Amino acid sequence: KEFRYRGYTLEQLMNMSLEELARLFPARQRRSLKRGLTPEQKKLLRKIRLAKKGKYKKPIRTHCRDMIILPEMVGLTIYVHNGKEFVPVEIKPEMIGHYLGEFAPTRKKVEHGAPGVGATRS
Amino acid sequence: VEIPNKEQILADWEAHPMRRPRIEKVTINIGVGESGERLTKAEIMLQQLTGQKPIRRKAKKTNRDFGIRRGEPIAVKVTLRGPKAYELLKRLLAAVDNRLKASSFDEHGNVCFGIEEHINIPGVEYDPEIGIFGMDVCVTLERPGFRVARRKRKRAKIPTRHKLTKEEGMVYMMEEFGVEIVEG
Amino acid sequence: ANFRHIVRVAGVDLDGNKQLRWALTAIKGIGINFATMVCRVAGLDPFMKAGYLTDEQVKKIEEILADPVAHGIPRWAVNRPKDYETGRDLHLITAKLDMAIREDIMRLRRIRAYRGIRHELGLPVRGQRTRSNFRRG
RNA sequence: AUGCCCCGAAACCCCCGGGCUACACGCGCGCUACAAUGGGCGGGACAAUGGGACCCGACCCCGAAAGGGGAAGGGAAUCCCCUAAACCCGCCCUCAGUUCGGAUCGCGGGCUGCAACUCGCCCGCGUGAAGCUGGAAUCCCUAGUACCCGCGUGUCAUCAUCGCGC
RNA sequence: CUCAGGCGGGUCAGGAAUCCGCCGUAGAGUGCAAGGGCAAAAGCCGGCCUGACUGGACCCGUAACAGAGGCGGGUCCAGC
Description:
Number of helices of chain A: 4
Keywords (chain C): Ribonucleoprotein, Ribosomal protein, RNA-binding, rRNA-binding
Shape of chain B: globular
GO molecular function (chain C): rRNA binding; structural constituent of ribosome
Number of strands of chain B: 7
Strand content of chain B: 15-25%
Protein name (chain A): Small ribosomal subunit protein uS19
Organism (chain A): Pyrococcus furiosus (strain ATCC 43587 / DSM 3638 / JCM 8422 / Vc1)
Distance between the termini of chain B: 10 Å
Order of helices and strands of chain A: HHHHEEE
Radius of gyration of chain A: 19 Å
Order of helices and strands of chain B: HEHEEHEEEHE
Oligomer: part of a larger assembly
Number of strands of chain A: 3
Radius of gyration of chain B: 19 Å
Structural class of chain B: alpha+beta
Largest sheet of chain B: 5 strands, antiparallel
Shape of chain A: elongated
Strand content of chain A: 5-15%
Distance between the termini of chain A: 59 Å
Largest interface: A-C, 13 and 16 residues
Largest sheet of chain A: 3 strands, mixed
Strand order of the largest sheet of chain A: 1-2-3
Subunit structure (chain A): Part of the 30S ribosomal subunit.
């Protein structure tokens, strides 16, 4: 089925301005947008806008894990820092309104081995 | 999908009246999978939905993985024929959207599908005895003179010209009622 | 009058010796608060023993459950205040509610979010400590 | 604070991101409960210690709640936090995994903070896991003490099942 | 009434549960070894029954040709 967010299609979401996107988004994202964007986030937006317009062909890397995905960021690969490397994340329509850091896991899955000598009172 | 032979095969159906087939039987199966009170619930459900008695299809061979034993009544089935079969097929096909997968048709123009919940004049009377809702529905077509291979006396084999095909079956379904899809 | 020991509302059998509030509570998707809300909207005394309900009253309850908001229920007392797809206010009952929650978790797992990963792994998702508690084995 | 040894363009100094918050498992100390010596609803009474300047904030208006806007007085025996709970009266529940239990999750609305996903707190509706009194063993306490029940403060931009007192 | 096995289709259902079509000379089954025989049956599913009976005759095999106590089998008459 065609993707829709709050009954709006992707083209409508792109055409909508920042205030309407904030209205659509949940309380946390709306509050973040209302407060504003930090200078690093503004630089990230400038890079994404240039890439979309077609004058930035290099991969996009950033440390901004607290950034919320916007519809204009759909269709791009962003390399998000996770502490050690820049893991790639492909922006999808269903990921709008989520924090960019949710898709860049930091820790690793644990495969517990045999318990040590001190793991028990014996 | 798109059938390319619709026009000339329409000329054919109209030119030869006896070449027009019909739904000889619609078979509905309830694969309960266990011989419990759910089996009786499904039996009464199909009894009040169709109007004729059920059949206790027993299990062939024993399999402990599925929790079955040979000869255990597992599933039930019912066969519908005639104008009442026509009406039941219409209501069932309306239950879900009037769309059939174009690939579901057999080689001999036989089609069928499955419904995972009663929705056809269903009646919310399911809390008393329901829970095993779900039904495999398959329809069989036939040009009129196919009882030659069924009659005991002077039984014979129908030629390949006189038997249905996938395209003819789907076009017949389209012409009578409902539409096909591209299944992707 | 006709005191029914068992009454079926919204496809779930309700007790006949229990008040209407807690009787409606038997349906997944409705609790004591929302049941009282529904009774007050329908105009039925919440304290009546379930079983005295008539066909008209049962159908009225069904309609209220179908469209709680249009019947006066506040938009902030519903189960789904803002549908992800349609963008309207909905209240889901039993099977539809289960499908909606399953779809939400499946969407998370599909987008590969942290909360989806944690859902599939079966570990806490809301930011708890897993060193001393949550021992399932 | 300091002896010797060591690093001394690095172990020194700043900045960004992550971690200290992981999780088959063993343990200490606690909170909540396993209900009638009670749960819910409406109503009716009673404190003290302390703190308050980007601070406490009466009072008024909006909101269903969280919360939002204006704003008097108070440098504090003058104003605020501050009309606590246990307890009492009337009604429903009548021994049941329930109108006990409140983990675990969905959606949505807010506050602080430059920043809330890793990794904060708050409120609405929905959901409803173990638990029906506990083996060997083991701990505190001699009077306004023990038990029961709430409040102030230190940490604090937000966060108290925590320490110190009432 | 027709089997085994296979091809195409169908909600849970997956290699394998129950179902709808086509092909299918027996590749199945027939209590048990092997061989032989069996497809509108000798196989699968049902209805009724107890000829798995009584009194007898003759004949073949064990034992060719070529002798036999005991035993197995075949063709019949009568009774019920």
